[PDB]
Amino acid sequence: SFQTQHDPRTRLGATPLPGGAGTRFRLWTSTARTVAVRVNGTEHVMTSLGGGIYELELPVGPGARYLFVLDGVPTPDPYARFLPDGVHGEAEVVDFGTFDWTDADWHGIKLADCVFYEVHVGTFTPEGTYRAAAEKLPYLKELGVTAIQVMPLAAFDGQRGWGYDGAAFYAPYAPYGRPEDLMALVDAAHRLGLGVFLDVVYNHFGPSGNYLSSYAPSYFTDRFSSAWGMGLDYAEPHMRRYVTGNARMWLRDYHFDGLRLDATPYMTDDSETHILTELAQEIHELGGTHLLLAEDHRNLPDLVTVNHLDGIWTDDFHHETRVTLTGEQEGYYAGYRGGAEALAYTIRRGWRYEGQFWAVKGEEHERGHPSDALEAPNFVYCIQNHDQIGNRPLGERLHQSDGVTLHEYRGAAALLLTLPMTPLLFQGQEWAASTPFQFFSDHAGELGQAVSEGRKKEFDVPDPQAEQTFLNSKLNWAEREGGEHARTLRLYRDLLRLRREDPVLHNRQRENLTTGHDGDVLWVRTVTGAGERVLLWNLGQDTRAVAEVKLPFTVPRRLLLHTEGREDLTLGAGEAVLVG
Numbered sequence: 001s002f003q004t005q006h007d008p009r010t011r012l013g014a015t016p017l018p019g020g021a022g023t024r025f026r027l028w029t030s031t032a033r034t035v036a037v038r039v040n041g042t043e044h045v046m047t048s049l050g051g052g053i054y055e056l057e058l059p060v061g062p063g064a065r066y067l068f069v070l071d072g073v074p075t076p077d078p079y080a081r082f083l084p085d086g087v088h089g090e091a092e093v094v095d096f097g098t099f100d101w102t103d104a105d106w107h108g109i110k111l112a113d114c115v116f117y118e119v120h121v122g123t124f125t126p127e128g129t130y131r132a133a134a135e136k137l138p139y140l141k142e143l144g145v146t147a148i149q150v151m152p153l154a155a156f157d158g159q160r161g162w163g164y165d166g167a168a169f170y171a172p173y174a175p176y177g178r179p180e181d182l183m184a185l186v187d188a189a190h191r192l193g194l195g196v197f198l199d200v201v202y203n204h205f206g207p208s209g210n211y212l213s214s215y216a217p218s219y220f221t222d223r224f225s226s227a228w229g230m231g232l233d234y235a236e237p238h239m240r241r242y243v244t245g246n247a248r249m250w251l252r253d254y255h256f257d258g259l260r261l262d263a264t265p266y267m268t269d270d271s272e273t274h275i276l277t278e279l280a281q282e283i284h285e286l287g288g289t290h291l292l293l294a295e296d297h298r299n300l301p302d303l304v305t306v307n308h309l310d311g312i313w314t315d316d317f318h319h320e321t322r323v324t325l326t327g328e329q330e331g332y333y334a335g336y337r338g339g340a341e342a343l344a345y346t347i348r349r350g351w352r353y354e355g356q357f358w359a360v361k362g363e364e365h366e367r368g369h370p371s372d373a374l375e376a377p378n379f380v381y382c383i384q385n386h387d388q389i390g391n392r393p394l395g396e397r398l399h400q401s402d403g404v405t406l407h408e409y410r411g412a413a414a415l416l417l418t419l420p421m422t423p424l425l426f427q428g429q430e431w432a433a434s435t436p437f438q439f440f441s442d443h444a445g446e447l448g449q450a451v452s453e454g455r456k457k458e459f460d461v462p463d464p465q466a467e468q469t470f471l472n473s474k475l476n477w478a479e480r481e482g483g484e485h486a487r488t489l490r491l492y493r494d495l496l497r498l499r500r501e502d503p504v505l506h507n508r509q510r511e512n513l514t515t516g517h518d519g520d521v522l523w524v525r526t527v528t529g530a531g532e533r534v535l536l537w538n539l540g541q542d543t544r545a546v547a548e549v550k551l552p553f554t555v556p557r558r559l560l561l562h563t564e565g566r567e568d569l570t571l572g573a574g575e576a577v578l579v580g
């Protein structure tokens with residue numbers, strides 16, 4: 001008996017009418033005295049309905065260009081479905097009923113079956129478009145990933161960016177392609193049996209192109225701020241519906257299988273029903289199998305058990321792994337010792353911090369909560385993602401950091417891809433890509449100069465505003481064909497096949513997973529009715545024979561996969577083996 005707050009009849013923005021009657025334009029404003037829509041260059045006064053709601057129906061169709069005129073000021077539509085001239089331009093009327101979907105036999109994907117592959121549309125291919133990305137779908141299918149995780153697509157200012165400066169949340173970023181190009185990508189993925197997930201940013205709007213305050217200051221509050229402006233006021237129902245209507249668009253109209261909510265700790269809301277719970281309600285009302293994941297650092301199980309999200313990106317595993325391999329201690333890395341015994345504990349507990357003091361300078365508090373309620377798929381683990389590469393001064397990848405060998409990098413992949421937690425890979429990880437993933441942007445005027453200045457001060461650091469920084473982050477596909485890149489890719493293919501085929505690795509219960517260590521050797525054991533597997537990873541500097549590892553059980557005898565393809569059960573420095 002939850003009832004959606006959304007009715008297509010009353011949808012804000014421009015919505016095609018039935019019977020070829022045209023388009024219904026609607027907006028909410030708390031402050032404008034005169035309100036008009038300017039369609040294909042001609043102004044038309046809109047009808048006041050009360051409650052600050054204004055509406056007009058005209059016989060224009062999909063493809064018509066428009067914006068709203070508030071007290072005589074031409075203002076983009078925050079509910080724009082497409083912005084062909086960018087975030088300060090006219091919107092285009094879009095009809096979601098015109099695309100010929102062929103994915104009727106696709107029925108979504110369960111979290112326990114996801115292996116995510118994080119794509120940044122702009123850098124994933126030379127062209128940096130959806131159409132070019134769709135051409136790599138057969139590669140990803142054969143690689144053995146099962147869900148693409150796309151970085152944010154909401155329109156932002158400039159000709160490249162990561163996506164976190166999105167300002168028009170309903171409008172896919174025009175340089176990547178038109179709406180039907182996005183639909184084509186999703187339909188192609190579904191035809192190959194791949195899920196597609198979208199990163200969405202409901203904690204802030206970017207600095208350029210967010211016109212919501214021009215309509216009603218009360219979308220936002222001064223009670224708290226975001227990175228870019230005033231905080232999003234989730235006590236205001238129109239603000240709540242801006243983001244729940246957006247989530248429903250992506251899932252229903254673009255056929256995404258799920259959403260990754262950026263920075264959920266910063267979605268502040270003191271309402272009786274928290275906005276995260278209402279999002280889950282609103283997406284579930286669609287009657288599909290869509291998932292919601294939270295990017296959340298609080299180690300808070302209530303995201304799943306109270307807000308009814310499906311899982312959480314949980315960085316403790318990533319951080320413990322990077323410190324193990326590099327020894328680094330700057331910033332939040334100071335929260336971790338690293339090492340076999342540390343990694344065994346973090347895996348056992350799902351996350352490390354369950355209420356203990358977080359001693360990181362400038363951040364000290366009792367961090368986290370007991371993870372007992374969560375099951376293995378609820379934790380999303382990685383050793384690389386956009387932030388854990390791009391937030392480094394030079395954007396270098398894990399195998400490119402000082403002191404990391406390709407053998408250790410290959411071992412880390414084995415640990416990630418045999419655990420029952422839900423893994424995520426970053427584009428190009430699988431072939432130990434040679435290119436960095438740096439922070440790049442393309443803001444105009446003084447804002448652009450401020451970004452460049454802010455990056456320099458925070459940490460030669462590549463200028464985010466420079467074209468070269470974007471281009472240096474482009475994937476080089478040809479390199480995967482040779483050398484150590486090809487060797488790494490063969491290993492990733494082998495690991496993903498094992499994950500898919502091995503009956504014991506199908507385990508998704510923490511009850512069946514144990515971990516421990518002997519010196520610098522980590523072991524992870526899975527036991528189910530199908531048998532036993534043990535992953536051993538030598539995190540030492542020396543060679544270790546499997547026979548000589550002290551274990552509280554009898555080690556399995558059969559060598560299933562060795563990360564350096566050795567015939568004997570011996571581990572060189574940084575190497576791993578799976579036995580059964």
Ligand SMILES: OC[C@H]1O[C@H](O[C@H]2O[C@H](CO)[C@@H](O)[C@H](O)[C@H]2O)[C@H](O)[C@@H](O)[C@@H]1O
Nearest residue numbers: 300301302303305306369370371372373
């Ligand atoms: O303050 C947030 C919540 O804290 C508790 O819930 C966490 O800790 C419990 C045991 O301390 C776990 O059982 C639970 O799964 C965790 O989310 C508290 O029990 C909740 O009511 C609070 O909302």
Ligand SMILES: OC[C@H]1O[C@H](O[C@H]2O[C@H](CO)[C@@H](O)[C@H](O)[C@H]2O)[C@H](O)[C@@H](O)[C@@H]1O
Nearest residue numbers: 322323324325326327328337338339340
């Ligand atoms: O060598 C001095 C450091 O020794 C320890 O750090 C090493 O050993 C950890 C496992 O105990 C690894 O995770 C880490 O990468 C190594 O650098 C110690 O923890 C450090 O505080 C010392 O500076």
Ligand SMILES: OC[C@H]1O[C@@H](O)[C@H](O)[C@@H](O)[C@@H]1O
Nearest residue numbers: 297315316319331332360363
């Ligand atoms: O991963 C733990 C870290 O999460 C970050 O994204 C938080 O902003 C930071 O303050 C914390 O140290």
Ligand SMILES: [Mg+2]
Nearest residue numbers: 518519520550
């Ligand atoms: Mg020992």
